[PDB]
């Protein structure tokens, strides 16, 4: 089936081996504990012998502890395998989340990935764990009650091995009979859900017509279709049990049968018969869960094939050599022409903006529209269609990943805050390389002492989510800080939500001045202060550059930026 | 103690009552082949001879096809009853769902309404029907295993009902030590889980800082986290079966102990030992199932409660009697004032709306924010909390909703459309009184079906959802229809889409210049052609009225609407 | 890059009228704002008229109700129509896109 996976949880052998030697004794507990019932009947009340009788309950009370204790180990140390070979299949998952393309996380993928994810890893582990146990410890059984048999008997152990295996075929094709009505049934009831569902998205316009009485009907109608398909499921399920039951049945008359038929039969005593009877009736879990398992590989197998399209299916693409220290200098667009993946209508036509060294950009848009993909392609957050980014002579195609956005500080409102000490976010992934007096200098720089003081740790204070959570533009002061302490040569303002002017707005322009005194910056912006100052003004709309110019010699030209200002006046 | 609750099940007496006598009749079977299996042992081996072990091989087989048509009408004729409770309780339940007051739906939880009310009310019965299904019979298996004791024994019953009690405090409290655990692991699993979904969704400030290598050994720590959580769990479930496994285990060498004794031998033929232990190892799995079921009787409470508190929760209040035919009139609004539930800042100031009667205004503003929460108050969606809307010199608190309803038509570029045929969608909740005929003469008149006859069914074909559909440039043309058909008094159009569809404004603008031929109505408007032929024209700015005049009449007055103008030129 | 070229007339008698064009192609035409600028041989770069996306036309200061301006989208040209001339208005005159730090044509002056 699976030879290639051993050395995949190699690594486990010492857990998997322990499983294997400690679940077979489980099923020998019950083989010895059924042999035993013979010396309690035949030589324990046939006879006169109370010898046996006496110590028969110590090895009962023996019997069990083993029995109890191969249990927990053999459903410890197999979840401990199951626990290791799941996380490590998730930590080879998720490292792999961390580098497919933005695209991919923008809305493509519903809220709920961390839950499909550790739902088929979850479920996957499960299930193959089960197969194994089954198959492990009811093959014991099986090979324990057919020893026992043979020992004891010599005609209906071979009875029943020419028996079970109708009982066995009998039990796969119930079986399937049932899981095939298991899918007729979803059809329909995937069906009837969304028939459901459609009533109550509009519920407005049920009111607005006074049409309640031709929505109690219809659900009725709905209600009773729901009642009528869980009744053929359960009407399905409860057939599925009584005619296995009753095959085996017939396997126990036909073996009465033949233990009193002829003559040549009889030589069992009152004692080995029991034994064999005994043994007949605890054989029958092991003959349905061993010819059952089939399809509990299928349910691991297939969240593993859901699993393994996602594994490697597509990263950033990753090309080019050229390594940038620090790209001081010029960042052009050209001709550049992007496309939204998953739509029609470009976003940015023909594009001719260019971003002198030092100098700052200011993009001043009503839309809302076509300002902040480009925000999103100075850093390759996508991949553009026709043109190309010139960045000091390269092109950003050409550069490395690891590198190029080394440069680019989405300083904005919202930027995420891990949930770690606020030292760790004003020194992000480089406090290795970052000595903390560099931390606690920038954090006065950008005037941010304020939001670390009054705390109560300060420099150790949880601020993420399941932290204490500062205000949202404390967030922002955060990006100003980090920004500050990496001096990216690139920078790329938001300026969001524009609200906190009680003296906040203030120190938000106060930080920023000196920001953008150097870092040629593509500024993002709605703010009259920052446009102002600007030093070469490029408006948009709706797809495609407008008119450009310097807000002090632009308003003697009426155009669209000035027919903007007057509203936003 | 569910005294005073009977009737509720009254109707569906007949189902349980057969569920009982052909449930007892399950366990009855299983007793009868125990005490069966006495006089196979001894009267069968012991007594030298046949004529015994051709009877029982039939009587097997019989009783085990009593088992199996028993088992299937129990659990059928049970699971109709479930059936038919569910779809009672869950008819009511959404017969209460639409009357709930239109603050909810908007958002408020919609999202798993549907699932939260099936899921729900199907493990409210689930549950019940379960602890139904196994305090009869495995509570009438002990019965019948202890009558067969008696019958065969005089002192091993009498322990062993001394004995079996132990055994049942010993499966409540290690079942407790169960429950405990689960909780505390089940908080342990929501930080973990907090933080998995914390680290993903600024996964574009992961990448633009270059921080790859941190949120690996993150994911490493809280998945190690995750793995070592399982175990705890898995490692506490493992030992909650062998020790009781082992109590019993204990109670049965206990039981064999005291047949050693000296009195209790000569009352014990090689068979009724048999039995009576038969008896005892099959008592177990009643006597472990029948002392949790306040594990069930709990959850089905507990989802009954969880749904009874929705069940009977806030409404709309109908107050007032005055009834209308039709309100041929002026709504006026006056000094009203209304804020959104859940939010803090007024949508509406002080407003002074005074609609003339047969004439039509339009609500221009250049928000899209503060004007379509008009269209949800002259409709008595919501209800103001400070003003008054006078209706013909009445108020709308006053008027019955039924009728007040009745009245408005809220002709759209949106409409929810019902999944039934066409001519049912625009004569919707009154087919009964009206004529195919007006359905025809009006779907003409609103110069819709012209694309209703190229429909292939037509006046039958279904255009609501998971049917064939109509597309966003019909919708609203089928509206205009129902409109017409229905004649209603007062009109609140949206045009939604910010311009009309291509080569599709021919109809549009038609037939809505008949729908408005008369008939008041307060048409939101945002395109500049039902706004030019208005009659007294309103801005809003954000809160409130700011400029009101008619269109010719106003572009003289610069102010606001004529900026508006411009813009939008 | 996108090109433009202006098409004007020559000396003419105070106060007459006269209509100038200026094509413009190789880029979305259909958008972008035009405009006319005027400089004086001694005097700097002055702006004359504007049009915008939304034909939202604007005369400076000047000839405010003077002057008229508008764009043909089948043809990819614009059209600026001239009327009540003035000896003073005797300068240098330039077809110009996308604002003032945008692009320049070569002109034609006019007397």
């Known amino acids: 089936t699976f030879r290639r996976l051993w050395p995949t949880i190699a690594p486990f052998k010492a857990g998997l081996i322990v499983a294997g030697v400690a679940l077979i004794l489980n099923a020998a507990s019950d083989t010895f504990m059924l042999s035993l019932l013979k010396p309690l009947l035949d030589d324990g009340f046939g006879k006169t012998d109370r010898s046996v009788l006496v110590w028969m309950p110590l090895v009962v009370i023996g019997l069990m502890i083993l029995r109890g204790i191969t249990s927990y180990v053999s459903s410890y140390c197999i979840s401990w395998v199951s626990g290791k070979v799941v996380m490590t299949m998730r930590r080879r998952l998720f490292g792999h989340m961390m580098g497919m393309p933005v695209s991919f996380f923008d809305k493509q993928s519903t809220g709920t990935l961390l839950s499909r994810i550790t739902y088929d890893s979850e479920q996957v582990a499960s299930s193959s764990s089960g197969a194994l146990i089954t198959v492990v410890r009811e093959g014991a059984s099986i090979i324990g009650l057919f020893i026992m048999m043979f020992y004891y008997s010599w005609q209906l152990s071979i009875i029943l091995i020419v028996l079970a295996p109708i009982v066995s075929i009998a039990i796969r094709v119930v079986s399937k009979r049932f899981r095939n009505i298991s899918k007729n049934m979803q059809n329909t009831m995937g069906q009837v859900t969304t028939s459901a569902e459609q009533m109550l998205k509009g519920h407005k316009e049920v009111l607005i017509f006074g049409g309640q009485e031709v929505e109690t009907k219809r659900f009725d109608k709905v209600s009773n279709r729901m009642r009528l398909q869980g009744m053929k499921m359960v009407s399905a399920s409860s057939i599925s049990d009584p005619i296995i039951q009753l095959i085996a049945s017939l396997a126990l008359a036909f073996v009465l049968y033949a233990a009193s038929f002829p003559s040549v039969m009889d030589s069992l005593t009152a004692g080995t018969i029991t034994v064999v009877f005994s043994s007949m009736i605890a054989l029958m879990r092991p003959l349905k869960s061993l010819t059952n398992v089939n399809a509990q590989f299928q349910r691991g197998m297939a969240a593993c094939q859901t699993l393994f399209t996602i594994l490697d299916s597509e990263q950033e693409k990753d090309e080019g050599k050229r390594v940038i220290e620090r790209a001081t200098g010029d960042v052009e667009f050209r001709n550049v022409t992007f496309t939204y993946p998953g739509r029609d209508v470009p976003a940015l036509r023909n594009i001719n903006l260019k971003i002198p060294a030092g100098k700052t950009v200011a993009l001043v848009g009503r839309s809302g529209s076509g300002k902040s993909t480009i925000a999103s392609l100075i850093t390759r957050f996508y991949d553009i269609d026709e043109g190309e980014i010139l960045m000091d002579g390269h092109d950003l195609r050409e550069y490395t990943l690891a590198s190029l956005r080394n440069q680019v500080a989405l300083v904005s409102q919202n930027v995420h805050l891990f949930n770690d000490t606020v030292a760790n976010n004003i020194a992000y992934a480089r406090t290795e390389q970052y000595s903390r007096e560099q931390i606690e200098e920038a954090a006065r720089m950008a005037y941010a002492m304020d939001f670390i003081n009054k705390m109560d740790n300060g420099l150790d204070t949880v601020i993420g989510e399941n932290g204490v959570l500062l205000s949202g533009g404390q967030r922002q002061r955060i990006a100003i800080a980090r920004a500050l302490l990496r001096d990216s040569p690139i920078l790329i303002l938001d300026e969001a939500t524009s609200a906190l002017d009680t003296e906040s707005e203030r120190a938000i322009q106060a930080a920023l001045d000196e920001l953008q005194k150097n870092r040629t910056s593509l500024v993002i912006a709605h703010r009259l202060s920052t446009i102002e100052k600007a030093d070469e003004i490029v408006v948009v709309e709706d797809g495609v550059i407008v008119e450009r110019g310097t807000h002090n010699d632009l308003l003697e030209h009426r155009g669209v930026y000035a027919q903007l200002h007057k509203m936003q006046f | 103690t569910f005294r005073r609750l009977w009737p509720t099940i009254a109707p569906f007496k007949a189902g349980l009552i057969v569920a009982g006598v052909a449930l007892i009749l399950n366990a009855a079977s299983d007793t009868f082949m125990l005490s069966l299996l006495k006089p196979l042992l001894d009267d069968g081996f012991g007594k030298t001879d046949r004529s015994v072990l051709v009877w029982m091989p039939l009587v097997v087989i019989g009783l085990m096809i009593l088992r199996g048509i028993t088992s299937y009408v129990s659990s059928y004729c049970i699971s109709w009853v479930s059936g038919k409770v569910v779809m009672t309780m869950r008819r009511r339940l959404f017969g209460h769902m639409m009357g709930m007051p239109v603050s909810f739906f908007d958002k408020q939880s919609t999202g798993t309404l549907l699932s939260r009310i099936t899921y729900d009310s199907e493990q409210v019965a689930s549950s019940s029907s379960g602890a139904l299904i196994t305090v009869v019979r495995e509570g009438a298996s002990i019965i019948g295993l202890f009558i067969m004791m008696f019958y065969y024994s005089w002192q091993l019953s009498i322990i062993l009902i001394v004995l079996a009690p132990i055994v049942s405090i010993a499966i409540r409290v290690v079942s407790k030590r169960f429950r405990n655990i689960s909780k505390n692991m089940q908080n342990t699993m929501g930080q973990v889980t907090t933080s998995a979904e914390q680290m993903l969704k600024g996964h574009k400030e992961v990448l633009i800082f270059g921080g790859q290598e941190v949120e690996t050994k993150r994911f490493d720590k809280v998945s190690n986290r995750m793995r070592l959580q399982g175990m705890k769990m898995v490692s506490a479930s493992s030992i909650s079966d062998p020790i009781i496994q082992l109590i019993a285990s204990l109670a049965l060498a206990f039981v064999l102990y005291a047949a050693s004794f000296p009195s209790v031998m000569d009352s014990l033929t090689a068979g009724t030992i048999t039995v009576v232990f038969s008896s005892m190892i099959a008592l177990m799995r009643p006597l472990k199932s029948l002392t949790n079921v306040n594990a069930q009787f709990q959850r089905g409470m507990a989802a009954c409660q969880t749904l009874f508190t929705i069940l009977d929760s806030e409404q709309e209040k109908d107050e007032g009697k005055r009834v209308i035919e039709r309100a041929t009139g002026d709504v006026e609004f006056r000094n009203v004032t209304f804020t959104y539930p859940g939010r803090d800042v007024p949508a509406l100031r002080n407003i002074n709306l005074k609609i003339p009667a047969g004439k039509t205004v339009a609500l221009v503003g250049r928000s899209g924010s503060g004007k379509s929460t008009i269209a949800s108050l002259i409709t008595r969606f919501y209800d103001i909390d400070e003003g008054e809307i006078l209706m013909d010199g009445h108020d709308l608190r006053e008027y019955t909703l039924a009728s007040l309803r009745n009245q408005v038509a809220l002709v759209s570029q949106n409409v929810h459309l019902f999944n039934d045929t066409v001519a049912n969608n625009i004569a919707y909740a009154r087919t009964e009184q009206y004529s195919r005929e007006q359905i025809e003469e009006a779907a003409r008149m609103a110069y819709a079906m012209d694309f209703i006859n190229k429909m292939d069914n037509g006046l039958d074909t279904v255009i609501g959802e998971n049917g064939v559909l109509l597309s966003g440039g019909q919708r609203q043309r089928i509206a205009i229809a129902r409109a017409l058909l229905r004649d209603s008094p007062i009109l609140i159009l949206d045009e939604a889409t910010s311009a009309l569809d291509t080569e599709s404004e021919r109809a549009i603008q038609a037939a809505l210049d008949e729908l408005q031929k008369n008939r008041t109505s307060l048409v939101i408007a945002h395109r500049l052609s039902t706004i030019e032929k208005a009659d007294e024209i309103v801005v809003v700015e954000d809160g409130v009225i700011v400029e009101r005049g008619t269109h010719n009449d106003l572009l003289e007055h610069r102010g606001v609407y004529a900026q508006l103008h411009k813009m939008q030129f | 890059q996108m090109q433009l070229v202006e098409s004007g007339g020559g000396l003419v008698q105070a106060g007459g009228s006269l209509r100038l064009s200026c094509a413009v192609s190789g880029s979305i035409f259909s958008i972008i704002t035009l405009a006319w600028y005027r400089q004086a041989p001694g005097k700097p770069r002055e702006n004359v008229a504007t049009?915008?996306?939304?034909?939202?036309?604007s005369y400076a200061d000047s000839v405010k109700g003077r002057f008229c301006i508008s764009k043909d989208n089948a043809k990819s040209t614009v059209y600026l129509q001239m009327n009540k001339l003035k000896p003073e208005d005797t300068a240098d005159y330039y077809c110009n896109a996308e604002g003032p730090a945008g692009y320049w044509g070569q002109g034609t002056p006019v007397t």
């Open positions: 049009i915008t996306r939304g034909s939202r036309t």
